């Protein structure tokens, strides 16, 4: 499912209610001046979906209401509307309407106009393929900087997070708790099937010495109903032993998780790079919990020679590109339905700007993108175009033609 439409009212630079024209299912690109309201829009989406913003302090409540001239608002909302024309959202509508409203001492979701709990939402989303474990459906230049400069250690702190080796344990515990809560029922069950078993056994000897009454008539029914339960307990007693085979095999595979996601992401890494920088050669190096101390990068833009450079010896935008390659290789290892990009080409020239725009034209066939740029290359790969103006203390976002967007980033 993708993002069909968004509605904002009272949220940051968006005082009056704004209703964005419905998105392309592929590459949407937003353009605007400084302080215009691009990154504010992306924050509104995040206010609804992103797991961090689920539990808000009382001051972040205030730093979201439009603060300005007029009657300083006391509640703001955002509504996302998902195109469910793939039924990835477990719901029998073609459109799902999820919205969140907030004030001071007030925070409530609304699934298709009925209230729900914050936990309800995070489960509805997880089952559409949209992890709360996944931070990469949204990339700001904050993260591309932070990732190009980052040391070899911080990048290993990133595989341990991608292997999911921590959420697995979070679930694996949620599982063993039920498993025991259920194993309680089984001893209650296995006990009533001992009363019924022996109460039915004497009821049969009573029946035979005749060779009160309404129990004697339908004894064979009690007998027949009982052996049907015995069948069901033997189902449990057998699925239990089965769940144990499973739990056993997963703990074996958690201890192969980190070494595993490394090889995949290393392979994906070199793939993404060799088509961003056709001719190039890049690779991840595991280096000395475990004896793993870091994950470093070895890039050779220059064809592939004895001009490999460890990554901090790369140029400044060369580090930007490689950080972008790594973010691409990781998303391949964990796709999301739609991706938000906030000024990613900001440090790359015009040639690497194209190569990133090209490689997004490829990923657009299979997922939704909404992005913001200042240069005309992420504009050819695009399918719909928006502008953000700031007009009268507030933000306006409207549809522009493709030349309206190029005339804005080339003047």
């Amino acid at each position: 499912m993708y993002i069909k439409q968004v509605i904002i009212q009272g949220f940051r630079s968006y005082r009056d209610q704004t209703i964005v024209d419905p998105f392309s299912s592929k590459h949407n690109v937003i353009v605007g001046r400084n302080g215009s309201g691009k990154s504010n829009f992306f924050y509104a989406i995040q206010f609804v979906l992103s797991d961090e913003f689920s539990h808000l302090r009382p001051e972040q409540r205030l730093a979201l209401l439009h603060e300005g001239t007029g009657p300083r608002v006391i509640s703001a909302f955002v509504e996302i509307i998902f195109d469910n024309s793939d039924n990835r959202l477990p719901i029998d509508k073609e459109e799902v309407s999820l919205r969140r409203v907030i004030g001071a001492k007030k925070d409530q979701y609304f699934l298709d106009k009925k209230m729900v709990t914050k936990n309800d939402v995070m489960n509805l989303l997880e089952s559409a393929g949209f992890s709360r474990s996944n931070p990469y459906y949204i990339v700001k230049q904050g993260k591309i900087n932070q990732m190009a400069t980052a040391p070899d250690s911080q990048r290993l702190k990133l595989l341990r997070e991608v292997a999911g080796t921590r959420v697995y344990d979070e679930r694996k515990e949620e599982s063993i708790s039920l498993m025991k809560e259920t194993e309680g029922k089984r001893e209650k069950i296995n006990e009533l099937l001992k009363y019924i078993e022996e109460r039915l056994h004497t009821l049969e000897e009573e029946k035979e010495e005749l060779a009160n009454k309404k129990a004697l008539d339908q004894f064979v029914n009690f007998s027949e109903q009982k052996e049907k339960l015995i069948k069901r307990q033997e189902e449990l007693d057998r699925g239990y032993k089965s769940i144990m085979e499973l739990m056993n095999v997963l703990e074996l595979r958690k201890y192969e998780a980190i070494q595993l996601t490394f090889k995949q992401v290393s392979k994906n890494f070199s793939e993404v790079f060799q088509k961003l920088v056709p001719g190039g050669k890049a690779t991840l190096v595991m280096k000395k919990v475990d004896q793993f101390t870091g994950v470093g990068i070895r890039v050779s833009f220059t064809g592939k020679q004895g001009e490999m450079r460890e990554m901090q010896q790369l140029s400044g935008g060369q580090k930007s590109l490689v950080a972008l390659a790594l973010i691409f290789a990781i998303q391949k290892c964990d796709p999301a339905p739609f991706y938000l990009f906030d000024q990613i080409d900001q440090a790359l020239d015009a040639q690497h700007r194209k190569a990133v725009s090209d490689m997004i034209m490829e990923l657009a066939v299979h997922a939704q993108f909404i992005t913001t740029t200042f240069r005309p290359e992420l504009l050819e790969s695009a399918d719909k175009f928006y502008g953000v103006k700031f007009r009268n203390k507030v933000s306006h976002i409207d549809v522009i033609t493709a030349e309206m967007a190029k005339d804005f980033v080339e003047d």
């Binding site: 009690f222 307990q233 699925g239």
Partner: protein
């Protein structure tokens, strides 16, 4: 496949009916998590592991309900 049901059981579990809980084979739902055709992130193997255990819980949840009516029905006529 069947993993769609287990998946649904782990998160949006209220879309599973008693008939789905009963008809569901835990033994073979496990068989298709352990041997997946598209080997999966450990993060989603644990999502599945939870979906299974939900069903196993809910099976026992019904059996124990049934097993008590069976006890009080015959403890009554007798």
């Amino acid at each position: 496949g069947p993993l769609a049901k287990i998946w649904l059981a782990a998160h949006w579990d209220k879309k599973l009916t008693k008939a789905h809980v009963f008809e569901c084979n835990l033994e073979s739902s496990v068989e298709s998590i352990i041997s997946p055709k598209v080997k999966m992130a450990l993060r989603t193997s644990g999502h599945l592991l939870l979906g299974v255990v939900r069903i196993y819980h809910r099976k026992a949840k019904y059996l124990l309900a049934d097993c008590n009516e069976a006890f009080i029905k015959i403890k009554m006529a007798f």
